[PDB]
Design a protein around this ligand. Structure first.
Ligand SMILES: CC(C)CCC[C@@H](C)[C@H]1CC[C@H]2[C@@H]3CC=C4C[C@@H](O)CC[C@]4(C)[C@H]3CC[C@]12C
Ligand SMILES: CC(C)CCC[C@@H](C)[C@H]1CC[C@H]2[C@@H]3CC=C4C[C@@H](O)CC[C@]4(C)[C@H]3CC[C@]12C
Ligand SMILES: CC(C)CCC[C@@H](C)[C@H]1CC[C@H]2[C@@H]3CC=C4C[C@@H](O)CC[C@]4(C)[C@H]3CC[C@]12C
Ligand SMILES: CCCCCCCC/C=C\CCCCCCCC(=O)OC[C@H](O)CO
Ligand SMILES: CCCCCCCC/C=C\CCCCCCCC(=O)OC[C@H](O)CO
Ligand SMILES: CCCCCCCC/C=C\CCCCCCCC(=O)OC[C@H](O)CO
Ligand SMILES: CCCCCCCC/C=C\CCCCCCCC(=O)OC[C@H](O)CO
Ligand SMILES: CCCc1cc2c(=O)c(-c3nc(C)cs3)coc2cc1OC(C)=O
Ligand SMILES: CCCCCCCC/C=C\CCCCCCCC(=O)O
Ligand SMILES: CCCCCCCC/C=C\CCCCCCCC(=O)O
Ligand SMILES: CCCCCCCC/C=C\CCCCCCCC(=O)O
Ligand SMILES: CCCCCCCC/C=C\CCCCCCCC(=O)O
Ligand SMILES: CCCCCCCC/C=C\CCCCCCCC(=O)O
Ligand SMILES: CCCCCCCC/C=C\CCCCCCCC(=O)O
Ligand SMILES: CCCCCCCC/C=C\CCCCCCCC(=O)O
Ligand SMILES: CCCCCCCC/C=C\CCCCCCCC(=O)O
Ligand code: NA
Length: 383
């Protein structure tokens, strides 16, 4: 069949994707700009990512449509049209990695997060990452290309002019660059690193939330030990342990009271007065009920929110991998298996479209998983 028919479907689909990528991502950018509760370091990378997606719609998609035609062009101009999407993908990878790291810093060392991760450091990092993205993505423009070996038969058949080639992705971009440099080195490795960071984030969270329960359990069991003791020494044992575990957990009024009360009881227990120390240890229950238990519930609630936010970020990264992998895998087959028939055109189109679809998905994930974005989206849309 005439190429314009299958080309028509592909183009239409690309155009639809472009519209959706632009709309959703402009909305993300708008939400961050308007809502000061969304203005934080994590979200600056979210905006960088959104910008990359906007550019997929504005530029990468129109470029992809263009290159699908195999139009006559100067080889280097053709390279730009072919590789610009790689710049966008690379930037996305950097943003994704930054978000994972940012969340790891928040969970591992929350006391030092604000002084370490600032808005100014973030903007500089974003700038650097875009520069690096251009370098990586446009590496073929620096000389790793097939412009030195033009397919002159193909160019002459299409009536191309001198110094021009039929602009086709696989004719100008070397597959070794695509597979070894782009896929393995610049996409695969960072994604694996991201996986590693997420694993550490979830482990740190799981460990902290066990530790909170342990401390609590230690306060309750040592209380019971004090109640059932027969001598001062047993009481002194259980309170010394308790004092250590009160401080660990406090590493304000309520904890001052708690430690003070343990000290009261300990002094009584060091004087041999068992019954008085036990009654004194009983007052600890009042401090636990109205102070310590509230600290435990808030600390646990803060951790769960961090796990929820980390899962939301991980999903985004997972989705990027899912959307891009098929295309990369196809490139691997093309490159590693020259005896294998090339993947059919329809599959190529499908793989490309899927890759482009990744630029649509983030706004939905934010809307469904993050309440503050969702509420802001509604307001923007309502207003
Ligand atoms: C990342 C997840 C979703 C897995 C996706 C795997 C996809 C990309 C895999 C699964 C089966 C694969 C195909 C298996 C057989 C062939 C025949 C060969 O002549 C060309 C490549 C081609 C057509 C492969 C292209 C890539 C392929 C379609
Ligand atoms: C953790 C995962 C997602 C990383 C990506 C796995 C990739 C690199 C793997 C998965 C399936 C693999 C392919 C499976 C089969 C063939 C056909 C063979 O004639 C050449 C290698 C080739 C083409 C492999 C290249 C590498 C490959 C594409
Ligand atoms: C999923 C992750 C861990 C990657 C898995 C990669 C696997 C599928 C890759 C790695 C090395 C690859 C093999 C390397 C060499 C050859 C010789 C070639 O004449 C036929 C394909 C064959 C036999 C490949 C089949 C696919 C292969 C086994
Ligand atoms: C949603 C996404 C904006 C500015 C220009 C857009 C127009 C871009 C398209 C212009 C293409 C012109 C063209 O290809 O002309 C070929 C020539 O006529 C054959 O010899
Ligand atoms: C030649 C054809 C291609 C050219 C196409 C134009 C080039 C677009 C490139 C980069 C824009 C990147 C924008 C990144 C926006 C993120 C900014 C941000 O997040 O702000 C942080 C905040 O200011 C902290 O206080
Ligand atoms: C923003 C939109 C960008 C679309 C960019 C599309 C670039 C269109 C190039 C088409 C072109 O230059 O065709 C003329 C002919 O091939 C020369 O001999
Ligand atoms: C980053 C590392 C992760 C995955 C690499 C997977 C390695 C895939 C290696 C494929 C090698 C291969 O296919 O060799 C066949 C050879 O060309 C005979 O014709
Ligand atoms: C079908 C339309 C033109 C075309 C495009 C590309 C393309 O954009 C990529 C890419 N890979 C990545 C990781 C980013 S972009 C790979 O192979 C292609 C092959 C193509 O044409 C073929 C199959 O011969
Ligand atoms: C997501 C939606 C996927 C549907 C269509 C993607 C484009 C498929 C184009 C088919 C072209 C057939 C051909 O030219 O051989
Ligand atoms: C295309 C790139 C658009 C960049 C949008 C920046 C929005 C600023 C912000 O939300 O802080
Ligand atoms: C919208 C993207 C613009 C597509 C232009 C393709 C031109 C190809 C050609 O001139 O043959
Ligand atoms: C709005 C954009 C609509 C049409 C422009 C895209 C079509 C450009 C010519 C493609 C020809 C081809 O696919 O061979
Ligand atoms: C914030 C946006 C940052 C953009 C900075 C641009 C950095 C450019 C760095 C490397 C890209 C090199 C591409 C070479 C183009 C060759 C063009 C030609 O053929 O003349
Ligand atoms: C750093 C800068 C590296 C990019 C320098 C410009 C590359 C131009 C390549 C070319 O025109 O062939
Ligand atoms: C590889 C390993 C992957 C690890 C991933 C790491 C994360 C874990 C035109 C239409 C216009 C109308 C618009 C709509 C109007 C309403
Ligand atoms: C719908 C999604 C289809 C995805 C994978 C199916 C594999 C397609 C392979 C068919 C091409 C094989 C060939 O003839 O070269
Ligand atoms: Na992206």
């Amino acid at each position: 069949a005439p190429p314009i028919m299958g080309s028509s479907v592909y183009i239409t689909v690309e155009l639809a994707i472009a519209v959706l990528a632009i709309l959703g991502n402009v909305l993300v950018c708008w939400a961050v700009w308007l809502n000061s509760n969304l203005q934080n370091v994590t979200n600056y990378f979210v905006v960088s990512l959104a910008a990359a997606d906007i550019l997929v719609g504005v530029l990468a998609i129109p470029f992809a449509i263009t290159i699908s035609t195999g139009f006559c062009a100067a080889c280097h101009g053709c390279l730009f049209i072919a590789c610009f999407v790689l710049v966008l993908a690379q930037s996305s990878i950097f943003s994704l990695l930054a978000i994972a790291i940012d969340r790891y810093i928040a969970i591992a060392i929350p006391l030092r997060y604000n002084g370490l991760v600032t808005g100014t450091r973030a903007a500089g990092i974003i700038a650097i990452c875009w520069v690096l993205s251009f370098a990586i993505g446009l590496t073929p423009m620096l000389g790793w290309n097939n412009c030195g070996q033009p397919k002159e038969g193909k160019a002459h058949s299409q009536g191309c002019g001198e110094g021009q080639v039929a602009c086709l992705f696989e004719d100008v971009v070397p597959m070794n660059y695509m597979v070894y440099f782009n896929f393995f080195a610049c996409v695969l490795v960072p994604l694996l690193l991201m996986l590693g960071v997420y694993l550490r984030i979830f482990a740190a969270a799981r460990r902290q939330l066990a530790d909170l329960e342990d401390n609590w359990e230690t306060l309750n069991d040592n209380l019971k030990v004090i109640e059932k003791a027969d001598n001062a020494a047993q009481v002194k044992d259980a309170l010394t342990k308790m004092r250590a575990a009160a401080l660990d957990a406090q590493k304000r009024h309520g904890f001052d009271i708690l430690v003070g009360q343990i000290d009261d009881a300990l002094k009584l227990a060091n004087e041999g007065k068992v019954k008085e120390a036990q009654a004194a240890a009983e007052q600890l229950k009042t401090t636990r009920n109205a102070y310590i238990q509230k600290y435990l519930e808030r600390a646990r609630s803060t951790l769960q929110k961090e796990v929820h936010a980390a899962k939301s970020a991980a999903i985004i990264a997972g989705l990027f991998a899912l959307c891009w992998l098929p295309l990369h895998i196809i490139n691997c087959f093309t490159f590693f298996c020259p005896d294998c028939s090339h993947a059919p055109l329809w599959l190529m189109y499908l793989a490309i479209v899927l890759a482009h679809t990744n630029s649509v998905v983030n706004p939905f994930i934010y809307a469904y998983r993050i309440r503050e974005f969702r509420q802001t989206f509604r307001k923007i849309i309502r207003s």
